[PDB]
Amino acid sequence: RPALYFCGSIRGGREDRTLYERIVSRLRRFGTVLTEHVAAAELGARGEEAAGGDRLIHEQDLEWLQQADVVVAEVTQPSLGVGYELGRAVAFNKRILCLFRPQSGRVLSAMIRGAADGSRFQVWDYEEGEVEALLDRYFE
Amino acid sequence: RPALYFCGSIRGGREDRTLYERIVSRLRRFGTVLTEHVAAAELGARGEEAAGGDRLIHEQDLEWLQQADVVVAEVTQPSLGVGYELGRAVAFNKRILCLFRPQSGRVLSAMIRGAADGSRFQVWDYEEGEVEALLDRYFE
Numbered sequence: 001r002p003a004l005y006f007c008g009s010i011r012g013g014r015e016d017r018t019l020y021e022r023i024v025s026r027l028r029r030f031g032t033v034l035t036e037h038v039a040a041a042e043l044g045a046r047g048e049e050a051a052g053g054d055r056l057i058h059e060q061d062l063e064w065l066q067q068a069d070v071v072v073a074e075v076t077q078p079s080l081g082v083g084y085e086l087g088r089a090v091a092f093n094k095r096i097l098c099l100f101r102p103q104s105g106r107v108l109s110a111m112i113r114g115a116a117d118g119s120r121f122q123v124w125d126y127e128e129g130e131v132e133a134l135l136d137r138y139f140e
Numbered sequence: 141r142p143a144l145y146f147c148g149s150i151r152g153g154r155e156d157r158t159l160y161e162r163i164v165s166r167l168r169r170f171g172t173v174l175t176e177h178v179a180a181a182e183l184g185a186r187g188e189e190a191a192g193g194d195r196l197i198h199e200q201d202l203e204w205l206q207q208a209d210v211v212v213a214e215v216t217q218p219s220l221g222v223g224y225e226l227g228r229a230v231a232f233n234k235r236i237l238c239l240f241r242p243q244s245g246r247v248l249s250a251m252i253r254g255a256a257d258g259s260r261f262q263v264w265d266y267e268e269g270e271v272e273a274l275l276d277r278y279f280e
């Protein structure tokens with residue numbers, strides 16, 4: 001099956017976390033979501049105490065990024081980790097889709113919006129209600 | 141002169157902005173800070189209206205990142221742009237120094253802390269009072 005790498009802020013708030021779950025749920029229809037092979041707590045979702053070591057989280061993520069056929073990033077919440085994953089993914093020449101919610105009232109980083117080229121790196125603005133449909137449009 | 145690339149959150153708060161200025165001021169002693177060749181407003185410091193286009197900001201930053209001998213990043217505020225710049229810099233095999241203030245009460249992203257190798261990628265925790273001394277220690 002196609003290998004998918006999902007990324008979002010490890011400190012995402014309630015609305016962001018509900019959306020990461022809906023996104024990962026829909027991505028399962030199209031391929032293997034590598035990033036769900038370990039518990040969210042082990043990657044840091046419940047704080048430093050439940051997390052694995054920083055070096056292990058970095059190495060595991062770089063291994064998954066290299067195995068992935070497509071990178072899907074939810075870029076609504078500012079995150080060094082998501083940005084770093086996107087930087088490494090661009091340099092690996094990965095097919096990348098960024099999903100951004102303008103209704104958050106945020107302005108997406110010019111470094112992410114400016115990386116878009118309409119083909120291998122796309123940034124799609126969306127509203128919460130249509131995220132599954134947009135994933136279907138991308139992965140059809 | 142050695143070419144230095146500085147990066148910090150374009151949405152950094154008051155304390156972060158005072159520190160970026162002190163850092164760039166001290167870096168001038170060691171080399172050319174490429175990132176000050178354009179006004180902070182043009183990179184987005186005063187909002188989208190005064191900023192240049194996203195693609196121009198991305199391309200200008202990638203050109204400066206490739207010309208740089210050392211990348212210095214202040215990673216206290218979560219930022220997709222700073223993370224992305226760090227990802228691209230790692231893949232360009234740049235010498236990188238990240239400066240993080242634990243007194244902010246934040247926990248630095250495991251993707252940045254886990255990228256450290258003690259040599260080409262270092263993460264130094266600091267308190268505001270010693271930032272100039274630590275830059276002297278790094279660049280001596």
Ligand SMILES: O=C(O)c1ccc2c(c1)CN(Cc1nc(N3CCc4ccc(Br)cc4CC3)no1)CC2
Pocket residue numbers: 006007008009010011012013017020035036040043044045057061079080081082085249250251
């Ligand atoms: O924000 C950071 O600085 C940061 C630091 C480390 C990591 C990353 C970011 C992202 N990496 C890739 C990745 N994202 C994800 N999802 C799904 C799991 C999940 C559940 C609940 C919450 Br609340 C947040 C999350 C995170 C998003 N699964 O894998 C993992 C390591």
Ligand SMILES: O=C(O)c1ccc2c(c1)CN(Cc1nc(N3CCc4ccc(Br)cc4CC3)no1)CC2
Pocket residue numbers: 109110111146147148149150151152153157160175176180183184185197201219220221222225
């Ligand atoms: O946070 C982001 O998502 C993001 C988006 C775009 C850019 C970046 C980040 C960072 N890039 C490299 C860079 N940083 C900087 N400094 C100094 C200038 C300055 C003054 C005041 C404030 Br308040 C903030 C800043 C920014 C830090 N000079 O060049 C430029 C483009």
